[PDB]
Design a protein around this nucleic acid. Sequence first.
DNA 1: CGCAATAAATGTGATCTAGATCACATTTTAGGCAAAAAAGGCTTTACACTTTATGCTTCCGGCTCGTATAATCGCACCTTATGTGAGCGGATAACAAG
Length: 88
Amino acid sequence: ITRSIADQARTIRIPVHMIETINKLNRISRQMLQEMGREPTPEELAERMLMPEDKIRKVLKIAKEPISMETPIGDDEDSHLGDFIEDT
DNA sequence: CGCAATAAATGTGATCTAGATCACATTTTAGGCAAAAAAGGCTTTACACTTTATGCTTCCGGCTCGTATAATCGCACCTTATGTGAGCGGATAACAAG
């Protein structure tokens, strides 16, 4: 059961380490918060990890749902999320 | 031929320009022909294009395996309480026929 939901979980394919890299930076964020009491700035963790600081920000942009289309916005009658995007 | 009356036609003659002359010497004009500066011509050589075989290396990328671990279990507390009528099948009670 940990093999099937290990890849084909979301509606779209998702890598393995891409979801294992999130909780990796989690069990350390509160680790420095329970001691010092301040938010771990992207400077001290840049020396303990293999990620610089710039490219690591674009990684979070990938980790999403992202979002459906047939979802009410304002009119809640005929207006849909995928009905406001112009065509090229 | 004499008479009517709105338009067109008439004279004046001194003043002041407008338009024309002449023969010869000066000044302008036209197209002409090379030279210089420019257009594309049609060569022959200097270099530069991505492409694609390849294989070797380090770094970032993407995927799994087994292991170690405890469990196969437990309260008290916070705040609400959809709307209806119309259409439908099923279960139950009252009824006439045998």
